[PDB]
Design an enzyme around this catalytic site. Structure first.
Site, mmCIF file in Angstrom:
data_model
loop_
_atom_site.group_PDB
_atom_site.id
_atom_site.type_symbol
_atom_site.label_atom_id
_atom_site.label_comp_id
_atom_site.label_asym_id
_atom_site.label_seq_id
_atom_site.Cartn_x
_atom_site.Cartn_y
_atom_site.Cartn_z
ATOM 1 N N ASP A 64 0.807 -1.227 0.000
ATOM 2 C CA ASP A 64 0.000 0.000 0.000
ATOM 3 C C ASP A 64 0.842 1.279 0.000
ATOM 4 O O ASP A 64 0.306 2.393 -0.094
ATOM 5 C CB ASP A 64 -0.957 0.003 1.188
ATOM 6 N N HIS A 68 0.393 8.693 9.292
ATOM 7 C CA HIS A 68 0.771 7.289 9.544
ATOM 8 C C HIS A 68 2.257 6.990 9.433
ATOM 9 O O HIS A 68 2.701 5.914 9.855
ATOM 10 C CB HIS A 68 0.043 6.341 8.586
HETATM 11 O O1 LIG Z 1 -6.535 7.361 4.982
HETATM 12 C C1 LIG Z 1 -5.891 6.746 5.819
HETATM 13 C C2 LIG Z 1 -5.410 5.378 5.535
HETATM 14 C C3 LIG Z 1 -5.747 4.736 4.416
HETATM 15 C C4 LIG Z 1 -5.226 3.367 4.190
HETATM 16 C C5 LIG Z 1 -5.447 2.373 5.138
HETATM 17 C C6 LIG Z 1 -4.955 1.091 4.931
HETATM 18 C C7 LIG Z 1 -4.243 0.804 3.774
HETATM 19 C C8 LIG Z 1 -4.022 1.796 2.824
HETATM 20 C C9 LIG Z 1 -4.514 3.081 3.034
HETATM 21 CL CL1 LIG Z 1 -4.231 4.368 1.811
HETATM 22 N N1 LIG Z 1 -5.612 7.283 7.001
HETATM 23 O O2 LIG Z 1 -5.196 8.608 7.083
HETATM 24 ZN ZN LIG Z 2 -7.859 8.101 7.119
#
Ligand SMILES: O=C(/C=C/c1ccccc1Cl)NO
Ligand SMILES: [Zn+2]
Ligand SMILES: [K+]
Ligand SMILES: [K+]
Length: 399
Positions: free
Chosen positions: A99, A141
C-alpha cells in the site's frame, strides 16, 4: 490572517500520486471557484539551500537510511528495469511496498507535503498568520523508518517538532477516520505535545491502534509523556451530532487544562458518510458538520492553529468539505461573513461534482460515557504529573 499553502510546483507534486491522483487540484480549484483565495495569504512551500539542509530537516524525525531508501525508490521507478531482489528486500525493510508502492515521483511527492507543512509552521511562529491551512499535508501514519497507509514522510511530526522547538505546548487533534498512530508514536515520551485522536477502531481495521490494548487498558504515553496521548475510538455509523457530542467536551477540557501555544488539526475527510470507507456518517452540512463543529470550537480558542488534510477518498466530497472548512476559518479568524452559493460554480473540474452539482454532500441521515470518565481521569493524571493548574469543577462541568 489566514494562510493557505499552495504553488504551481506544489500542485503538480501533490497531484502526482497514484492513490490521491488529482484530489488536491479539485480542492484548490473549488476553493478558488468560490473566490476564497483573495481572502487568503498564500504560503509558499519551504525550500532548502542544499541536499544536506533538506536531509537535516527531514531526519529531524526520519532515519537517514529510510530517507535514502525513499530517494532510491524514486530513482528506481524512473528507470524501467525491474527492481533487483536486493532492492526489493531493501524497500521491504522500510515497508516501501504493497500500500506504499514506489512511483516515479514518490520522494518529490512525499517531500512536498513536508515542505508545505514546515512553511505553515514557520508562518505561525513568526506571527505572519493566525491560522495556516495545508490541504496537501496531513500524513499521520508515517513512522521513523517506515511508510504506512500511503504516508511516506510524516509532515505533521516535522511541523509539530518545529513548533515546540521555537514553555511551548502543542495540542494535536486528529479528526481522521483512522488513528493518528505515527504522530502519537513520535511524541509518546513528550509531555509538551499532547495528542488526541478520534477514530474508528475495530478488529482488523487499519492501523489497529488507539484502542484497548492486549481486563485490558489504554496505553497513553510513557516516561515524562505518561497520560499525554489521548484516544477516543468510536464504533461505525456515528453521525454529526453524536460525533460532535463525543469530542466536544474533550477538546474544551484539553484546551483549558493544557493551554497549548499551538493547535495542529488533521482534518482527514474519510469520516464523510459518502467516503468509500462508509464507516462514519459525518457531513459537510453548514445550516451541523462534525468537522465544522470541531474546527469552529478549536478556532474559538484563538490559539495559532495549523489545519492539515489527510485521508478522503471521495475526491469531490473531500473538496466540498475542505472548501467549507476553509470558508469557516476565514469567517472565524477575520471576523467577516463568508457566503457560499449552495451550488458548485462553473470551473475546470465542475463536471466532477455530478449529478446535482451542489455543495452539500449527497447524503440524507453509554460507551462514549465510559470514555469520557476514562479521559477526564487521564487529563487529571496528566495535569497532576506535569504540575499544571487546572480547575477540576469547570473541567468536570463540561460533561
Ligand atoms: O486514509 C488513511 C489510511 C488509508 C489506508 C489504510 C490502509 C491501507 C491503505 C490506506 Cl491508503 N488514514 O489517514
Ligand atoms: Zn484516514
Ligand atoms: K483520527
Ligand atoms: K505526547
Amino acid at each position: 490572517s489566514v494562510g493557505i499553502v499552495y504553488g504551481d510546483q506544489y500542485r503538480q507534486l501533490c497531484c502526482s500520486s497514484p492513490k490521491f491522483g488529482d484530489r488536491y487540484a479539485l480542492v484548490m480549484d473549488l476553493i478558488n471557484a468560490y473566490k476564497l483565495i483573495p481572502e487568503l495569504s498564500r504560503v509558499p512551500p519551504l525550500q532548502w539551500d542544499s541536499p544536506s539542509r533538506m536531509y537535516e530537516a527531514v531526519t529531524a524525525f526520519h532515519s537517514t537510511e529510510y530517507v535514502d531508501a525513499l530517494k532510491k525508490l524514486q530513482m528506481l521507478h524512473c528507470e524501467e528495469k525491474e527492481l533487483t531482489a536486493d532492492d526489493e528486500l531493501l524497500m521491504d525493510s522500510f515497508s516501501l511496498n504493497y500500500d506504499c508502492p514506489g512511483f516515479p515521483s514518490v520522494f518529490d511527492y512525499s517531500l512536498a507535503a513536508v515542505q508545505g507543512s514546515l512553511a505553515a509552521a514557520s508562518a505561525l511562529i513568526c506571527r505572519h498568520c493566525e491560522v495556516v491551512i495545508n490541504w496537501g499535508g496531513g500524513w499521520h501514519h508515517a513512522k521513523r523508518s517506515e511508510a504506512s497507509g500511503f504516508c511516506y514522510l510524516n509532515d505533521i511530526v516535522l511541523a509539530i517538532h518545529r513548533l515546540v522547538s521555537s514553555q511551548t505546548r502543542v495540542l494535536y487533534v486528529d479528526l481522521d477516520l483512522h488513528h493518528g498512530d505515527g504522530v502519537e508514536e513520535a511524541f509518546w515520551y513528550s509531555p509538551r505535545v499532547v495528542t488526541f485522536s478520534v477514530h474508528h477502531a475495530s478488529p482488523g481495521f487499519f492501523p489497529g491502534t488507539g484502542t484497548w490494548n492486549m481486563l485490558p487498558i489504554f496505553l497513553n504515553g510513557a516516561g515524562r509523556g505518561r497520560f499525554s496521548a489521548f484516544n477516543l475510538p468510536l464504533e461505525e455509523g456515528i453521525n454529526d451530532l453524536d460525533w460532535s457530542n463525543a469530542i466536544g467536551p474533550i477538546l474544551d477540557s484539553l484546551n483549558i487544562v493544557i493551554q497549548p501555544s499551538y493547535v495542529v488539526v488533521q482534518c482527514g475527510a474519510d469520516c464523510l458518510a459518502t467516503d468509500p470507507h462508509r464507516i462514519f456518517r459525518l457531513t459537510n452540512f453548514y445550516p451541523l458538520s462534525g468537522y465544522l463543529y470541531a474546527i469552529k470550537k478549536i478556532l474559538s480558542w484563538k490559539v495559532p492553529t495549523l489545519i492539515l488534510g489527510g485521508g478522503g477518498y471521495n475526491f469531490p466530497d473531500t473538496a466540498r468539505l475542505w472548501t467549507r472548512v476553509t470558508a469557516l476559518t476565514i469567517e472565524e479568524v477575520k471576523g467577516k461573513k463568508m457566503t457560499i452559493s449552495p451550488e458548485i460554480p462553473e470551473h475546470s473540474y465542475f463536471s466532477r461534482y455530478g449529478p446535482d452539482f451542489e455543495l452539500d454532500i449527497d447524503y440524507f441521515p453509554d460507551s462514549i460515557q465510559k470514555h469520557h470518565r476514562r479521559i477526564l481521569e487521564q487529563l487529571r493524571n496528566y495535569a497532576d504529573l506535569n504540575k499544571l493548574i487546572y480547575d477540576y469543577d469547570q473541567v468536570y462541568q463540561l460533561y
